[PDB]
Amino acid sequence: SSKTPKLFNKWSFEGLETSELALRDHISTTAAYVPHTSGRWQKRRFYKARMPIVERLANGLMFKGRGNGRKLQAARLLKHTLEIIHLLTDENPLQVVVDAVSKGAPREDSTRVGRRQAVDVSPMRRVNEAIYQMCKGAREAAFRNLKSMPECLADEIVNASKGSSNSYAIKKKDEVERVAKANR
């Protein structure tokens, strides 16, 4: 009598998809109960592309010296974050986060091969950068603030999914893509 898993026993993985055709093979929509898996995901080069996306989010919250290694704490923060996302948008929270990951990184960048020269961005780097910038923007917003980390992280994610410039990740993506057009 097996049944398909739901995250935190509440949120359904059925029908989860990305609209960005170019990122479909690098965002994993595999069902799981909790972010913890304790696997060896860095053994090979592209193996980390099969890690479930919500767990990749949790790994992005263990950053400073005070946060290093605290995975169970990161799981609890994400559980509260998803409930707030559902209240704000009235949608499936899992769909909202994959929309945010699909938009939070620039598709064009400029590097120092040429002055500077404009290059394209590999799909693996686009999803790595979206997670990094969204977690970094929420950590800085909550530093000396009455707002909690779950509330700050929820606002960053819903704004990114809408492409709104009020997101930290969207704002930095507009600057990098604009500069790269200059160095074409």
């Binding site: 609890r76 559980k79 409930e83 707030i84 209240l87 009455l146």
Partner: protein
């Protein structure tokens, strides 16, 4: 950043807590702390009362985190 948040909940802000806070979607102690300009401590105590009288509904709870919504 003076941030003059009151600690003792006068009668004018008691009306606002019982009238319009229930109409909100996504109630949180920090969210109504700055809407009413009151300390987070008395904001959380005021919300605990509304959960007892069944005026708002609790959604996610933890030892340190509590988020409510409307009925």
């Amino acid at each position: 950043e003076a941030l003059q948040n009151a600690v003792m909940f006068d009668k004018e802000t008691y009306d606002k807590l019982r009238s319009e806070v229930p109409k909100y979607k996504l109630i949180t102690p920090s969210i109504i702390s700055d809407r009413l300009k009151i300390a987070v401590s008395i904001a959380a105590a005021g919300l605990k009362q509304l959960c007892r009288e069944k005026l708002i509904r609790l959604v996610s709870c933890s030892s340190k985190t509590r988020v409510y919504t409307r009925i």
